[PDB]
Amino acid sequence: MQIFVKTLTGKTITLEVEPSDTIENVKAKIQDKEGIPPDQQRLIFAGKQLEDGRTLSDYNIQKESTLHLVLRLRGX
Amino acid sequence: GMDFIFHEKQEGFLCAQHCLNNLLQGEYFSPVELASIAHQLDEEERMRMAEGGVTSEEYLAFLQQPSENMDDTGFFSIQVISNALKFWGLEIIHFNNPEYQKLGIDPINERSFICNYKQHWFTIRKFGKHWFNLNSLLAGPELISDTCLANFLARLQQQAYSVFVVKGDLPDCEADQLLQI
Ligand code: NA
Q1: Where is this cross-link: Glycyl lysine isopeptide (Gly-Lys) (interchain with K-? in acceptor proteins) (chain A)?
Q2: Are residues B90 and B170 in contact, defined by beta-carbon separation less than 8 angstroms?
Q3: Using CA atoms, how far apart are residues B92 and B49, in angstroms rounded to an integer?
Q4: What CATH class does B28-73 carry?
């Protein structure tokens, strides 16, 4: 299924994922696709920072759902 | 040396500000501008968290977390650098971005990059046909020869380094005008 990952800085990323995918897997997809390393990713959905070990299914994330991507990298 | 190049040397930890100022070639950015950019980014994140209810456990736990955009040592984030660049019509992306990489651009033909090494921001940019390192931790601007540039940016692969390419027409400055032909 298809979900959307909207950053705070303009870009919305369109991913192909499955409900049994873990947040960990999704972050790895985002790395594959966008080159953003998992460590620099904070993912938010419906008011909750998503935990790596749980699944999209666990969070009730469905087709056309929109997640939010906060990037974590500081300097200095 | 290299006096016609604008080079803001490192005051303590204000490296984001020197990085941006050195890229744009002047005193473009001040501490208040960047703190406000971070505060608004913080508020944007809070709004996304409030989607769950400002009374929920998750929301309240979040308010007890440090900012991801301006920490208590005064470090600014990639999101703040991003938004400061938008002021000037500039976009920024991980140099290792797979869509960008497919373009097949020779890095020698870009105009500016921003690097993050061990939590320090520095700029590398081109004036005329010449690449310079504009790192605030440096006595002064230093040439980087074309044969070296790509290899320099490839430090990405190290855990220590993150390398960004800044796309768009940079504002005009005396250094470009002097070094062009
Ligand atoms: Na890296």
Answers
A1: 76
A2: yes
A3: 26
A4: mainly alpha
Architecture label for domain A1-75? Roll (3.10)
Q: Is residue B148 annotated as a catalytic residue, yes or no?
A: no
Distance CA B156, CA A28 (A): 17
Resolution (A): 2.7
A74 and chain B in contact, CB less than 8 A: yes
Technique used to solve these coordinates: X-ray
Contacts of B60 (CB under 8 A, 6+ apart): none
Enter the tokens of residue B102.
């497919």
Sequence-distant contacts of A8-15: CB under 8 A, at least 24 apart: A8/A68, A8/A69, A8/A70, A8/A71, A8/B41, A8/B44, A8/B45, A8/B79, A9/A71, A9/B79, A9/B82, A9/B83, A9/B86, A10/B86, A10/B91, A12/A66, A13/A69
Q: Which site among A5, A7, A9, A34 would you substitute to test the B interface, given the most B Cβ atoms closer than 10 Å to its Cβ?
A: A9
Domain with CATH 3.90.70.40 in chain B: 14-27+74-181
Tell me the C-alpha distance between B52 and B56, whole Å: 7
Asked if A44's CB is within 8 angstroms of B56's CB, the reply is no
Cross-chain Cβ contact B77/A10 below 8 Å = no
Q: B162 at the A interface (CB within 8 A)?
A: yes
Distance in Å, CA B119 to ligand 1 centroid: 12
Cα dist. A17→A2, A24, A45, A48, B146 in Å? 6, 12, 15, 19, 41
Which of A33, A68, A73 is the closest to B48 by Cβ? A68
Q: Which two tokens stand for residue B60?
A: 């309240």
